[PDB]
Structures are given as C-alpha cells and as structure tokens.
Structure 1
Amino acid sequence: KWWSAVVEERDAQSWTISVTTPADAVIGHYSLLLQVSGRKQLLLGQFTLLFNPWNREDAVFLKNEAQRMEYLLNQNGLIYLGTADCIQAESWDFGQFEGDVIDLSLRLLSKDKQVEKWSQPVHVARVLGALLHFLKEQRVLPTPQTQATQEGALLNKRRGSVPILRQWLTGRGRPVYDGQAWVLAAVACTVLRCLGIPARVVTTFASAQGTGGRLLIDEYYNEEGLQNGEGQRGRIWIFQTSTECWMTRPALPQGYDGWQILHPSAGSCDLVPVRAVKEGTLGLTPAVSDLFAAINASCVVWKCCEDGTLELTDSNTKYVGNNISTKGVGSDRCEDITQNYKYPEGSLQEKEVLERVEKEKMERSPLYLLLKAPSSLPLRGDAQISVTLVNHSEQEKAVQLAIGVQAVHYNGVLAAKLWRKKLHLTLSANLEKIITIGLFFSNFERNPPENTFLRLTAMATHSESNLSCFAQEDIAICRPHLAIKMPEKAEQYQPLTASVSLQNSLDAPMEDCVISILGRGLIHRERSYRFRSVWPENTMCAKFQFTPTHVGLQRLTVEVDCNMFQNLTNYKSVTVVAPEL
C-alpha cells in the first residue's frame, strides 16, 4: 500500500527494481534519489505520476472498459451546435496527448501554493475551473463592429483546443472573438483528460443562463414584432456548453458518486453532482439552486407600447432545457443523456419536486393563434410558413397581424433587423382561418452574419381589446451538403484515394473556391487546393491521394471556403490495420 520497491531479477552487472506506488499521492514532476550509507545522494532521473481510472482502490475509478477507452484515450471528438430542432455536429480535436500539454497544465496548476491538497481530484478540478474561467474573461476580445467579409474566412475557423490553450497562456497566436466563446468547456475537458480525470462535453439547448434564484424570465417586444432595446439580465440562450467529470464524493453524504457538472461562478468554482440536480436538493451546495433554475424555468412576455406602459400578452408556452445531448461511446453518433437531468414532464414525481422547491422558495381569450414553421431553411432559398387563427365569439372581429424576422447571435444578442410585415384581417362566425405565406431570402433587407440564427415572431393584436396573442420560433440556417467517398478499410503504407463531391445548390456562382484537408495521424499538417468557378447548375468533383501511417482508427476532415460562405466542415472515419506478415 505504501511506497515500496522489490529487487526481482538479479544479474552480475544489473538489477531490475520494481517501484510501486500508493493509491493517494500528489501528482506532478517527481525526482528519484538513491542514498547509500556512504556516498552523497544521487539523482537517478525524473518522471510524472498521474491518476488511473483502472485501479479499483483509487477514487476516480471507472468500472467499464469501453467507457474508459472513449472518455480517456480518445482524441477525436464532436461538439453539437445548432437549434434543438436540427442538430449539426462539428468535428473537434482535443489533442490531449500532445507533447506540451502536461507541462503547461502543471505550470498553470502550480500557482496555488496549497501543495498537500493536490492529492485529491476535487481540489484540482475546482481550481482549474476557476483559473480557466478567469483566463477566458481575460484574453477574449469582443467582435469588430465594422464588417470585414474578406477576413471572415480567418476570424471564425477553429483548428482544435491546443492552439487556443497556447494563445491564452502566452498570447502569441490568433485571438478568439466573442462569436465563439463556447470553446471554454472543451478546453477544460482537454485539461482534465491530460491530468487523468475522465470528462466529456455536453450541450444544453435553450438554457436559462443569466440571473438565477428566480423561476421567471421577462422579455420585451416591440409594437412591430421586434425587441426594443438590447439585452436583459436573464435571457434564453440558443445553446450553452458545459463540462461533466466523473469522480466520487467522499466529503458529501453517501450516495452521490458519478457524474458531476463543473460550474464556475462570477472567482470561485465548484462542482455539483447531477443527482442533486435531479432530486432538487438546494441546500447541499450553494450552486445547486442556480443550476436547477437554469434547466426548468418558465418565461413571460411583455408588450411595450408608444405610451411606455408595458402589457402582458397571452402566448404559447415554450420549453426550457430540452434535448440534452452528447457524444456516444464507441461510435460516431449522438446520444441523449437527458433522462439524467429531468423527470418526464407531467409525472407525479416532477410535480412533487416542483411543489417542494416552490414551497422552499416561498420562505425566501376569445381568439388565439398558432404557428407552423420549418425546422431548417436553405441558404439563398425560401420556405413557407403558416399561421392559424381561431376565434371564440359570436360577433365578428377585426385583427392586426404582424410578422417579424431577425437574426440573433448564440447568446441572445440581437444582430440585425431583417423583415417585418403587417396586415389586417376580419374573422367571422367563429371559424378558424389559416394564412400561408412564403419567406424568400431575396426579399430580405440585409445579409446575415457568419454565425446567427433567425427568430421568427408573430403578434396578433385584437382591434377591440388590447390583450394580444404572440408566438415565436427559432430556425437554423442549413448549408449545402458535402459528400465524402472513401473506402472503409485501408492497408498501412499504401496509397489511399479519397473523393470529394459538392453540388452548387445556391443561385450564385462560387468563386475563389479553396478547400483544405487535414487529419491527425493521416496527413502531416494541412493541405490546400484551388478550383475554378462553380456555376449554380453544375457541381464539382475532386480526388486526393495520401497514405496512412499509424495503425488503428483515424478520421479525416475536409473544409471548404468560397465567397458565399466559409468554414464548411465535414469528416469521415476509417480503420487501418497492420500489414500481413
């Protein structure tokens, strides 16, 4: 159990000494010294000691093997973006097993000066979360307000996690703008996979990041159907990334081992077990209440007017914290672990927990509409939407209907006003009425930014009564598909031919078509190729040749840039086997 060494095998000029380690020891750069009774103590070398989820008696221990191989030994991950209605994967490279990651991580850790509390993963995780959130608040620059499309090909391309770590510690590379501030979780996961703590990166769509401790969110909307002014203390983001780490909690009461969410606060961080979020125990850790408020809280909507008087409006209820997803194990598909965060809505158990948490917090329409909109909208294209209206009154009524479309960043920040339309209708005889209207991109007023999502709002004002009905939907923008053709198995030290196909679905000819291939263990760094003009009717088809070198499971990525769009990424996996003897 304690530090030990046995001399197992003996030769006249050699000894084979087997050093053994205790289960609870401080990690870091060690040094071995040999001291005979006579001579001065002699330096023998250096090594490093890390955590092992393979040992049974250590705290951070994983029983299943494939979970270990996916969560600890893997390097080629996925991060899910987009709206909850259509989820788009993006290939990402953690690269935790590079050369410099371990020494950089230990140098970041060593600014704590509390040495003996490094034997435990809780203290290390909390400290590293706090430091990485502080560094993100330090080195992230706001977006340039001026429009630079010619440099938009360089502002928003990401290569992995390690260049961002280097640029955050030393500041000798490209900065990361506010358009992509969600990298932080992945970075933290990188650090934990370096140190021995299993971790993964989850995405919560429609999360309530903002102020916490209150189960209600206010939103203000214009008479025309937009949002007057900018910002709010608590708003509903389109998505939000977070980090989960697997460990055991000895300091807590018994029954909380497993997954924990790492939560930094605006600096002291802390981590909370997921079962605490499901059961709802607020008083176990000061951070549980805000995280539980972050998942299931409801919003109310206010109507601003010309007089300045705010009005409540009756709208359809929207859900918060749905479609929790992450990378599946041993494959390249998504899996939802959302059953670990909430009960099914409308059960006795969820009603019980809601009533209990509300009791604990207590101590501290004649017409309506509804909207059908598609989940995805093509670039340089069009779609159809429909609004129905049902009245319940024997008398006829006049109504004014407004429709607004506008792009929004991923953190609720307004970007540009795009479209609005106002019309008058007369409903009669208590009959429903459906209005179908097209939406063409050519009818828009401005070009959308690089990473935005459109918010479509509809507001029906009754002419007689000032109480009005409201609905909103979110739509992500879809880009043309990028076909990769490549065989499943390849032989080592052999040529391999990949094919890439692209169809110009867009109405404009592409110019300055520049594509690039890269991949870890397949091609050395990065390759670039140029092309001719691609007309809107025709397609493009290209072919590349390389040769795999490292046996096992790899994947390659392709990336396309042009004048219409930038950073269109895709990936494909391959299994390479050792050659036959």
Structure 2
Amino acid sequence: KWWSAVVEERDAQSWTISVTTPADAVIGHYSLLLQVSGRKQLLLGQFTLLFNPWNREDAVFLKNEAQRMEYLLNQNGLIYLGTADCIQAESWDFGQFEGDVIDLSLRLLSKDKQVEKWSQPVHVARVLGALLHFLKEQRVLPTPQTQATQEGALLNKRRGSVPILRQWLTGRGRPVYDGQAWVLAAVACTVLRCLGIPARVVTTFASAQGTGGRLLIDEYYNEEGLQNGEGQRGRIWIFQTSTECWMTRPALPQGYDGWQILHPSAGSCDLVPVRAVKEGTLGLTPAVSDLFAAINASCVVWKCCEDGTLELTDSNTKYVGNNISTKGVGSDRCEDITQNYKYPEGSLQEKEVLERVEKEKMERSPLYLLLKAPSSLPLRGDAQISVTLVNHSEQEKAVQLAIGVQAVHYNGVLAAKLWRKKLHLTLSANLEKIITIGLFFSNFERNPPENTFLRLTAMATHSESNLSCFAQEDIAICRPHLAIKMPEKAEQYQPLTASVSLQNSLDAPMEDCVISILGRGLIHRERSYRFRSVWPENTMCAKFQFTPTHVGLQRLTVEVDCNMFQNLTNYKSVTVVAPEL
C-alpha cells in the first residue's frame, strides 16, 4: 500500500524489479536515485505520475470500460452549437496525447505552492479552473470593429486546442478574438483529460447568465419594437459551454459522488455536483444559487415610449435553459442529459422544490397573438413567416403591428439592425386574422455578420388601452451541405480514395473556391487545393487519394472556404485494420 520494490527474477547480471506505487501520491516529474550503504548516490532516470480511473480504491474510478475510452482515451471530440432547435456539430481535436501538452499543463500547475494537495485532484481542478479563467480574461482580444470581409477567413478559423494553449502560455501564435469565447470549456476539458481526470463539455441553450440569485430578467425594447441602447448586466445568451468532471467528494455529505460542473467566479473557481443543483442545496456551496437560477428563470419586458416612462406588457413566455445536450457514448449522435438537472416540467417535484426556493429567497388580456416562423433560413434564400391575431371583445378595435429583424451575438450582445416593417389592422367581432409575409436575403439593410443569429420581434399595440402584446423568435442561418463518400473500412498501408461534392444552391457566382483537408493519423498537417468558378446552379465534385498509417478508428475532416462564407466544415470517420498475414 506504500512504496515498495520486489525483485521478480534474478539473473547473472540482469535483475527485474516490479516497483509498486502508492494509490495516492503527488504527481509531477520524478527522479529515481540509488544510495549504496557506503558509496554516494547514483541517478537512474525520470518518470511521470498520473491518475487512473482503473483503480477501484483510487479517488478517480469509472466502472465502465468503454466510458473510460470516450472520456479519457478519445482525442477527437464534438462541440454542439446553434440554437436549442437546430444543432450543429463541430469536430474538435483535443489532442491530449501530444508530446509537450503534459509539460505545459505541469508548468502551469506549478504556480500553486500548495504541494501537499497536489495528490488531491479536487484542489488541482479548482486551481486550474481559476488559472484558465484568468488567462482567458488576459489573452482574449476584442474584435476589430473595422469592416474587412476579405480577411475573415484568417480570423475565425480553428485548428484545435494545442495551439490555443501555446498562444495562451507563450503568446507566439494566432490570437483568439472575443467572438469565440466558448473555447474555454474545450481547453479545460483538454487539460483535465491530460492530467488523468475524465471530463466532458456540455452545451446549455438559452442560458440566463449575469444576475446573481434573481429569477427575473428585465429586457427593454424600443418603441418601434427594436432594442433601445446596447448591452445589459444580465441577459439571455444563445448558448453556453461548460465542463463536467467525474469525481468523488470526500469532504461532502453522503450522496454527491459523480458528475460536477466546474464554474469559475469573476480570480477564484470551484465545482458543484449535479444532484445538489437538482435538489437545490443552496447552503452547500456559494456558487449553487447563481447556477441554479440560470437553468430556470423568468423574463419580463418593458416597452419604452417617447416620454421615457416604461409600462409592463403582456408577452409570450419563453423557455430558458432547456435541451441540454452533449456527445453520445460509443457513437457520433448527440445525447441529452437535461433530465440530470431539472425535474420534468409541469410536475410536482419541480413545484415543491421551486416553492421551497422562493421561500428561502424571501426569508433572506382582451387580445393576443401567436406566430409561426421557420427554425432556420437557407443562406441567400427566403422564408415565409405568419402571425395570427385574436381579440376578445364585443366591439371592434384598431391595432398597430411592428416587426423587426436584427442580428445578435451568441452571448446576447447585439450586432446590427437588419429589417423593419410597420402596418395597421382592425379587428371586428372577434375574428381571427392571419398575416403571412415573405422575407428575403435581399431585403436586409446591410450584410449580416459572420457569427450571429437572427432575432425577430413582433409588437401589437392596442389603440384604445395601453396594454399591448409582444412576441419574439430566434432564427439561425443554415449553409449548404457537402457530401463525402468513402468506404467504412480500409486496410493499412494501402491506397484510399475519397470524394467530396457540393451543389451551388446560392444566387451568386462562385470565385476563389479553396478547400482543405486534414485528419489525425491519416494525413500530415493539412493540405489545400484551388478550384474554378461554380455557377448558382451547378455542382462541383472532386476526389482525393492518400494512405492510412495508424491502425484503429480514425476520422478526417474537410473544410471549404469561399467568397460568400468562411469555414464550412464536415467530417467522416473510418476504421483501418492490420494487413492480412
């Protein structure tokens, strides 16, 4: 159970030792020395210590074997982006088994000086979370506010995490801008998997960041139906990434072993188990209430006016913090784990738990509408959007309808205004009124930004009274799909062919088509190729040939860069086996 050394077999000159290691020791670079009874010390070599989830008495232990492979031995992961309705997978290379990633992680860890807790990975997780959050605050650049679409391909292209770590530690690489600040979770997952703690990145859609302890968010809309001013303290973000670690809590009461969300504080970090979040144990960790409020919060809207006096309005309720998803186990399909955080909606358990929450905190329509909009918009395309209005009164009434479409960042930051329209209607004898309109890519007053989501706001103003109705929707923009053809199986040291095709579904001619391929264990670093013009109706097809070298399950990803858009990514997996003897 402690350090020991037993000679397994002895020969004339060769001796075999099977050295035992303690189940909980300080990790780092070690040195082995030998002392003779009389003579001096002689050095043997160096070695490195890591955790392992294969030991049942270790603090880190996972019962399943495949789950160890995905959460510790996998190097090609997926990140889920988009809105809650449409999900996009992006292939990421964590690359935790690179040559010098361990050196970077150890060198960064060496700035703690609490050496006695280096054998306890809870403290290690806390200090690394704090350090990475501070470094992210240090090294993330604000976006260049100037308009240069020609060089957008070199500003938003990602090649994995190893670089990000190299640029954050040494500052000798391509820096990262504020438009992609969700990579912090990926960096944390990479370094944690490097140290031997399994971790995984989850994505929460429509998460209310900002406010601490409140379940109410105020949003103020302009008189026209737009957003007056810019920014807010706490807003509803489009999505949020976070890191989850599998660990046992020895200092905590019984029943909290398992998954823990790592949440840094604006430095200092900490982590909280999932079940504690579900029950609502707010006195268990200072960072419980703020995280809990972000998964179920209410928003109310004030409609600004010319005088400036704000009046509360009746608006349609929106869902906050729903459809939590992550990478599936053993496959490439998304899996939802939102049930681990919340009770089922419209049930008892959520009702009593929430009412306990309110109690704990306090101790311390004649007309309306509903609207149908598509969940996505094809690039350079069009879509029809409908709204229906109903009134409930014996008399007629005049109404004023205002509709606006504007871009927004992924963290609730506005980008630009895109479209506006106003009309007037009259409802009589409580008859339904349906209005379907078309919206085109040519109707925009400017070019929408590269990484933004559209938000549409509809405002119905009642002429006689002051109460008025509001609604909004979130739309994403979908880009043309590209097809990849390649065999599911292949043999080592043999030629392999792949084909890629695309149909130009846009309305503009193609020029400067550049496509690149890459993949770990299949190709070298990356390879790029030119192309000719594609007209708005034709299809382009190409083929590539290579030779796999590393056995097992690999994958390769291609990306297309163009004049209309940048970084159009796709990927495909494959299995390669040893040659037949």
When the two structures are superposed, what TM-score results if normalisation uses the length of structure 1? Answer: 1.00
C-alpha deviations, 1:54-83, integer Å up to 9, x for none? 001001100110110110000000000001
Mapped to 2, the partners of 1:537 and 1:377 lie a distance apart of 19
How far apart, CA to CA, are the structure 1 residues paired with 2:427 and 2:440? 27
Q: Show the counterpart of 1:400.
A: 400
How far 1:359 moved relative to its partner? Answer: 0.3
Deviation, structure 1 residue 361: 0.2
Indicate the SS of the match to 2:294. Answer: helix
| Distance in 2 separating the partners of 1:402 and 1:437 | 13
How far does the alpha carbon of each residue in 1:16-52 deviate from its partner, in whole angstroms, 9 at most, with x for none? 0111111110000011111110110111000001000
Distance, in Å, in 2 between the alignment partners of 1:305 and 1:244 is 45
Deviations 1:121-145 (A, max 9, x none): 1000000000000000000010000
1:287 positional shift: 0.5
2: CA distance between counterparts of 1:555 and 1:361?
Answer: 50
Distance 2:409 2:108 in 1: 32
Q: Tell me the SS of whatever aligns to 1:31.
A: strand
> How many Å apart are 1:108 and its aligned residue?
0.1
CA distance in 2, matches of 1:398, 1:473: 24
In structure 2, how many angstroms separate the alpha carbons of the residues matched to 1:521 and 1:221? 52
Q: Distance in 1 between matches of 2:463 and 2:273?
A: 52
Residue 100 of structure 1 and its aligned partner are, at CA, apart by: 0.5
- 1:378 alignment counterpart: 378
The CA deviation string for residues 154-211 of structure 1, in whole angstroms up to 9 with x for no partner, is 0000000010000000001111001101000000000000000000000000001112
Q: Deviations over 1:506-539 (max 9, x none)?
A: 0011110000000000001100000000000111
Separation (CA, whole Å) in 2 of partners of 1:503 and 1:225: 38
CA distance in 2, matches of 1:160, 1:86: 24
Structure 1 residue 148 displacement after superposition: 1.1
Within the alignment, does 1:366 sit opposite 2:384 as a pair? no
- CA separation in 2, counterparts of 1:38 and 1:509? 84
- Taking the aligned partners of 1:538 and 1:346, their CA distance within structure 2 comes to 51
Partner of 2:436: 436
Shift of 1:222: 0.8
- Cα distance per residue 1:520-561 (max 9 Å; x no partner): 000011000000000001110000001100000000000000
| CA distance in structure 2 between the partners assigned to 1:233 and 1:280 by the alignment | 25
Secondary structure class of the residue paired with 1:284? coil
CA deviation after TM superposition for structure 1 residue 311, in Å = 1.0
Deviations 1:475-509 (A, max 9, x none): 01000001000110011001101000000000011
SS at match of 2:535: coil
SS at match of 1:178: coil
Give distance in 2, aligned partners of 1:287 and 1:83: 26
How far residue 109 of structure 1 moved from its aligned partner, in angstroms, is: 0.3
Q: Deviations over 1:223-264 (max 9, x none)?
A: 111100011111000000000000000000111000000000
Cα shift at 1:294: 1.1
User: Superposed, which structure 2 residues align to 1:66-465 within 5 Å?
Assistant: 66-465=66-465
Distance 1:148 1:27 in 2: 48
Corresponding residue of 1:506: 506
Aligned residue number for residue 532 of structure 2 = 532
In structure 1, distance between residues paired with 2:365 and 2:332 = 48
C-alpha offsets along residues 270-289 of structure 1, whole Å, 9 cap, x if unaligned? 00000001001100000001
Please report how far the alpha carbon of residue 119 of structure 1 lies from its aligned counterpart in structure 2 after TM superposition.
Answer: 0.8
CA distance in 2, matches of 1:40, 1:34: 8
Cα distance in 2 for partners of 1:21, 1:537 equals 66
Distance 1:572 1:544 in 2: 14
| Structure 1: gaps spanning 5 or more residues | none
User: Distance in 2 between the 1:207 and 1:64 partners?
Assistant: 31
Query: RMSD over aligned Cα, in angstroms?
Result: 0.5
Q: CA deviation at 1:213?
A: 0.9
Q: 2: distance between equivalents of 1:67 and 1:514?
A: 38
Please state whether the residue corresponding to 2:236 is helix, strand or coil: coil
Name the structure 1 match of 2:4: 4
Q: Can you list the C-alpha shifts for 1:71-126, whole angstroms capped at 9, x where unaligned?
A: 00000000000011100111111000000000110000000111111110100000
SS of structure 2 residue aligned to 1:179: coil
CA distance in 1, matches of 2:433, 2:42: 90
CA shift for structure 1 position 364: 1.6
CA distance in 2, matches of 1:284, 1:542: 58
SS in 2 for 1:166: helix
Count of paired positions: 581
Cα distance in 1 for residues equivalent to 2:510 and 2:322: 38
- Give, in whole Å, the separation in 1 of the partners of 2:550 and 2:62: 28
Quote the Cα distance in structure 1 between the aligned partners of 2:305 and 2:364.
Answer: 33
- What is the rounded CA distance, in whole Å, between the counterparts of 1:37 and 1:21 in structure 2? 24
Q: Distance in 2 between matches of 1:255 and 1:62?
A: 16
Aligned residue for 2:207, secondary structure, equals coil
CA distance in 1, matches of 2:165, 2:233: 30
1:328-386 CA-partner distances (Å, limit 9, x unpaired): 11111100011101001111100000000100000121100111100010010000111
Q: Distance in 2 between matches of 1:157 and 1:218?
A: 35
Distance 1:232 1:576 in 2: 52
Counterparts of 2:187 and 2:570, CA distance in 1: 21
Alpha-carbon offset, residue 466 of structure 1: 1.4
Q: Distance in 1 between matches of 2:412 and 2:337?
A: 25
CA distance, structure 2, for counterparts of residue 319 and residue 444 of structure 1 = 28
What secondary structure sits across from 2:230 in the alignment? coil
Tell me the distance in 1 between the aligned counterparts of 2:479 and 2:204. Answer: 23
Which segments of structure 1 move beyond 2 Å, counting only runs of 4 or more?
none
Q: SS at 2:99's partner residue?
A: coil
User: 1:416 deviation in Å?
Assistant: 0.8
**Structure 1 residue 465, shift from structure 2 partner:** 1.1
Distance 2:219 2:21 in 1: 58
Q: Which digits, 9 at most, give the CA deviation of each residue in 1:293-341, with x for residues without a partner? A: 1111111011110001001110110011011000011111100011101
The Cα shift of 1:150 comes to 1.1
How far apart are the structure 1 equivalents of 2:455 and 2:212? 24
TM-score, normalised to structure 2, is: 1.00
Distance in 2 separating the partners of 1:337 and 1:191: 23
